[PDB]
Amino acid sequence: NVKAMKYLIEHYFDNFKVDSIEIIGSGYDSVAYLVNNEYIFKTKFGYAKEKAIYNFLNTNLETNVKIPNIEYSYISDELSILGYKEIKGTFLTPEIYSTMSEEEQNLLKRDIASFLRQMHGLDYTDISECTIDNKQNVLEEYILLRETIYNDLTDIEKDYIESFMERLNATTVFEGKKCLCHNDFSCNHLLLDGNNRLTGIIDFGDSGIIDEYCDFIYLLEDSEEEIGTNFGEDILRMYGNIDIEKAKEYQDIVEEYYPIETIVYGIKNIKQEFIENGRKEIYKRTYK
Ligand SMILES: Nc1nc2c(ncn2[C@@H]2O[C@H](COP(=O)(O)OP(=O)(O)NP(=O)(O)O)[C@@H](O)[C@H]2O)c(=O)[nH]1
Numbered sequence: 649n650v651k652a653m654k655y656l657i658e659h660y661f662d663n664f665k666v667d668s669i670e671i672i673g674s675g676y677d678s679v680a681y682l683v684n685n686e687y688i689f690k691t692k693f694g695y696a697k698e699k700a701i702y703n704f705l706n707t708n709l710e711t712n713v714k715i716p717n718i719e720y721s722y723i724s725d726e727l728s729i730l731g732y733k734e735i736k737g738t739f740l741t742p743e744i745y746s747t748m749s750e751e752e753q754n755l756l757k758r759d760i761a762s763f764l765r766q767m768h769g770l771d772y773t774d775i776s777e778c779t780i781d782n783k784q785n786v787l788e789e790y791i792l793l794r795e796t797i798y799n800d801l802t803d804i805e806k807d808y809i810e811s812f813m814e815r816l817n818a819t820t821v822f823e824g825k826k827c828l829c830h831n832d833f834s835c836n837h838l839l840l841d842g843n844n845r846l847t848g849i850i851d852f853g854d855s856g857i858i859d860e861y862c863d864f865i866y867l868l869e870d871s872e873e874e875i876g877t878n879f880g881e882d883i884l885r886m887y888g889n890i891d892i893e894k895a896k897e898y899q900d901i902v903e904e905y906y907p908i909e910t911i912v913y914g915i916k917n918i919k920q921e922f923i924e925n926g927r928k929e930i931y932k933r934t935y936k
């Protein structure tokens with residue numbers, strides 16, 4: 649993989665020489681590479697929006713928090729590559745957080761809240777095409793379910809989905825303030841400097857104009873990978889002027905949707921393994 653990608657980087661970016669290249673991360677349909685111990689290259693076989701977002705934010709944010717600044721891009725239907733200088737630091741984790749003093753933890757939370765406040769406050773007219781309607785997306789995904797596999801699902805599966813749609817239809821949490829959100833704001837995207845302060849934020853690949861509540865979904869998550877509900881709550885108090893009970897209702901609805909989202913990903917990409925994982929996850933959730 650590394651040789652192919654070294655070839656493509658050198659072929660598409662004329663004067664660029666690859667002296668070293670390793671895989672630094674990978675998703676289910678992308679790979680990220682650290683090149684020359686100094687550049688991140690994110691690749692995929694979309695990136696246009698992500699690039700337009702980095703470029704919008706590097707123009708308009710006033711902050712000492714670093715974000716990707718795109719120096720190299722190649723965008724086509726069949727291949728997309730974004731390259732930028734690696735932001736240096738350590739990724740925030742539960743382990744690191746629990747070793748911080750009370751005052752270190754407070755300052756980190758203040759940093760986060762301040763970043764979010766600043767980004768959510770931007771005039772988003774120049775990026776106004778990047779709208780995301782989560783409720784409408786879910787309805788369209790449900791229609792796709794009904795057109796494909798819904799009738800072969802079990803009753804326990806069908807009840808879970810219907811019960812979710814009844815809840816979606818009763819909620820008011822999509823009727824609030826819209827703004828530009830990171831939209832994948834988990835602690836594996838936050839970088840700390842040597843004083844445990846926020847030095848950088850990565851992966852605005854899902855960013856767009858969407859509910860303000862979106863950027864608290866992971867901050868409020870209780871799981872091995874995130875810090876915890878209390879972290880999110882304190883950040884919400886520092887951020888201010890936001891209904892904390894609704895932020896939590898929004899997180900709770902998104903977490904309920906997860907197995908259905910997983911099924912849908914499998915339908916859209918013809919990956920049976922994902923249809924099966926989501927269906928199984930419905931059974932796991934039902935038997936708590
Ligand atoms: N230190 C550092 N690591 C980075 C940087 N950019 C990317 N990475 C590393 O590369 C990984 C993948 O980058 P990312 O943008 O999150 O990839 P993705 O394709 O959007 N995947 P996902 O949405 O699943 O997080 C990150 O988890 C991190 O390990 C950067 O600026 N600095």
Ligand SMILES: [Cl-]
Pocket residue numbers: 920923924927
């Ligand atoms: Cl299946």
Ligand SMILES: [Mg+2]
Pocket residue numbers: 832851852853854
């Ligand atoms: Mg991403």
